[PDB]
Design a protein around this ligand. Sequence first.
Ligand SMILES: O=c1cc(O)n([C@@H]2O[C@H](COP(=O)(O)O)[C@@H](O)[C@H]2O)c(=O)[nH]1
Ligand SMILES: O=c1cc(O)n([C@@H]2O[C@H](COP(=O)(O)O)[C@@H](O)[C@H]2O)c(=O)[nH]1
Lengths: 218, 219
Amino acid sequence: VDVMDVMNRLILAMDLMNRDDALRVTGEVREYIDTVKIGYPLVLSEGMDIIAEFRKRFGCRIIADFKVADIPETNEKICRATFKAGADAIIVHGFPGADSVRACLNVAEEMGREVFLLTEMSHPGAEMFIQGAADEIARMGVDLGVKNYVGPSTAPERLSRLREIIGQDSFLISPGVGAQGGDPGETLRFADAIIVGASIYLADNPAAAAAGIIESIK
Amino acid sequence: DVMDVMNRLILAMDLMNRDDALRVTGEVREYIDTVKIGYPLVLSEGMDIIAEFRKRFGCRIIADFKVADIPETNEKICRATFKAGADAIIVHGFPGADSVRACLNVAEEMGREVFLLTEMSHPGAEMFIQGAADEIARMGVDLGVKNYVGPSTAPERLSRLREIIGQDSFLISPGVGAQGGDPGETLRFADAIIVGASIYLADNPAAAAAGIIESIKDL
Ligand SMILES: O=c1cc(O)n([C@@H]2O[C@H](COP(=O)(O)O)[C@@H](O)[C@H]2O)c(=O)[nH]1
Ligand SMILES: O=c1cc(O)n([C@@H]2O[C@H](COP(=O)(O)O)[C@@H](O)[C@H]2O)c(=O)[nH]1
């Protein structure tokens, strides 16, 4: 169906692990972004309440990057807890199979939230097992009506293939830009938005880093 | 040398509120010294629940977080988890060797354990995990991983996993009870069984745990 709009096509990966730094750095770049990806590094350090804190302080969409990868019954519980904490969307692994994905879709439909299917990863180890399964995982998502996908900026031809599988109407976001070597502009040939973590949050000047990224893709 | 689990029985504590989780665990505390805590409880009550279990029950805690990210992020997850007091963490092997090593690095630094999840118990595991499982297990063996998780619901797969990891490795196995796995059959290959809802949702959890141990008193 209709997919979300991400301001400036840029999603902040907020993986700092203390609340003060996470809030401060996010504050520094709040003018450039309306969507923040929060994962386990921050949540396990500060608690699930950090999600509602971000939404209230910044008025942003929160994607919970929890790479959900359990059996269906447990996946439903994880999704329910996560959406109860205010997350707008959750990222789910496809490698555990269709029942595990459907469990997440069920909860997202009930609660009016979104699932992102992680089809392929950005790190070298992804080549061992994930890469060979990635096209089939993406097709599994398409066949189940998944609208939102995550694929790797560090493998542009794989990202291009993913876009071909999911079609032009699906929403695609892509990590590995900056620290992992992915290029903002090239990634946006295929992705609707890029995800950027440390090259912003570890920068001497995070606002300048975000502004520079946006300048390069204006 | 690997850990010893009292009565070869690990409680999967997947209740999602603190009072029920603590109470039910209290009911069965005499039967077990090792509890597996996952995201259902942790995301509902906070990471402080791990230290609470260790202090109240004196148990080993396995954090079932199915860690499945890039190496940099895996390191962060493991550090947060071990800082919260977890004795061990469960890590997926499907994201590959660098991602597993990141977890081993932190576990070595902090004096804790990694369990490698090689194969899963639910039907969807057939789609992608099953075909990779022997290679994931071999990857673990080649990296010196000593602790493994494999499925009670696929006994011949569990047997194959034991053949790959050898007799000296430690193997725990979920899917017993609710998912149809049998305690005794599973313990032919696994060092311990993991049991969740068939204990924690029972009308009488202590009776359920006692019944399970009674059925394996022989082993
Ligand atoms: O394939 C993937 C999937 C991810 O979610 N990620 C996540 O995206 C972020 C990347 O951060 P960074 O820009 O600092 O490399 C991290 O939160 C990481 O866990 C990734 O790097 N590769
Ligand atoms: O392959 C696997 C791996 C698991 O960790 N688990 C976990 O083991 C537990 C099984 O609980 P139960 O006995 O209620 O089915 C759950 O916490 C689940 O997430 C599993 O069921 N299958």
